[PDB]
Amino acid sequence: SLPVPGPDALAQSEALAASLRAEIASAGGWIPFSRYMERVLYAPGMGYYSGDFVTAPELSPLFAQTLARPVAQALDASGTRRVMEFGAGTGKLAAGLLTALAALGVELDEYAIVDLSGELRARQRETLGAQAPGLAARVRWLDALPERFEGVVVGNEVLDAMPVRLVAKQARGWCERGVSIDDAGAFVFADRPFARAEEAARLAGIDADEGYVTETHDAAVAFVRTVCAMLARGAAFFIDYGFPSHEYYHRQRAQGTLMCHYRHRAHGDPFVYPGLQDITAHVEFSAIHEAGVGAGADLLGYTSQARFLLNAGITDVLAEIDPSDAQHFLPAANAVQKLISEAEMGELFKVIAFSRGIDGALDAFARGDRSHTL
Fold it and tell me: Alpha helices of the chain — where are they, by DSSP H?
């Protein structure tokens, strides 16, 4: 069943929906899914994110403590002293990473948060004041990526929320799946030939039978190019759920990876209550790899979150807590298992990193690197 929102949320969703229906009609009855997704997620005031930013916020402490190790190693190796986080959710990772780095002897000249909409920083500032008092003063917020950056960039579950286009395999070949309105005014998917017939060529490599529907990630690719061109020295880590291309576009993944979350219920329909639910797609890491190295950065590593966290010392972090102290040990052990178990986040989530001015390997990627599978 599908719970009905309260009056105020419903009014918001209805206004957002009416604005999208009006846009679709004005455009001749069809818009790409990227445009739909951009508006329902990011419309000022009414979009989902712009008026549940990570999968498991309660894992942020142990996660940040562990991530701090390769972050510090990348700072040392590149001779840099700044971190920049894109998005940043409610600021739990920033508070954790700031605190953990400082505890390990690493002070930053600045921890920059990129909050394009302006809408996330108030809660982030509150979280930092509460959880990292006296490191909070090192945090600055940016309205856009700068032209140049020296330090370590962190993008945790941000690639998955960037707009995707949908593509569908017809007998006649690939086409674009966009959004139309039906005769009752409801949003409907609608398939149309590509404007740029060129854009079907990139899909030829997919082992897809007729009826296959999947996502392309132009916006994420554009973002990674921009980050890697900006990065002058240092590293950029992206943490997200997804797969290299062979697996992403596997013959059997014929409904793709699009998933929506409404009142923490996972389901496939992005036309449910516009503005009141999340819409995400998994990340296609081969294209992300090409994006970053094509901008001239080195690939620093690619592996599963489990392997990255294990390599980075998560079990050592856990082992600081004594097992007889059950009050602390069991929650910590359960957190670690959620982070690293194949059945939980450990395999599905991946870490990819790019670098400039880092020679050699990070310990976090030195065993079990998967770059050769990209």
Answer: 7-26, 33-42, 60-78, 92-103, 121-131, 198-201, 218-230, 245-248, 285-294, 305-311, 314-318, 326-340
Q: How far is Cα 345 from Cα 306, in angstroms, rounded to an integer?
A: 8
Residues 6 or more apart whose Cβ sits within 8 Å of residue 298? 354, 355, 356, 358
Contact 343, 69 (CB under 8 A): no
- The domain of 103 spans 1-374
One-character DSSP codes across 25-68:
HHTTS-EEHHHHHHHHHHSTTTSSS----SS-GGGHHHHHHHHH
Q: Which method resolved this structure? A: X-ray
Residue positions counted in the chain: 374
Token output for 7: 């009056």
Flag whether 311 is marked binding: no
156 annotated as a binding-site residue:
yes
CATH code, domain with 234: 3.40.50.12710
Phi first, then psi: what are they for 66, rounded to 5°? -75, -45
Tokens of 359: 């020679």
Q: Per the structure, how many domains does the chain have? A: 1
Query: Nearest-CA neighbor of 210 among 250, 249, 177, 170?
Result: 170
Q: Is 203 in a helix, a strand, or coil?
A: coil
- In the numeric block, the tokens 């890491």 are attached to 285
The encoded tokens of residue 364 equal 């976090």
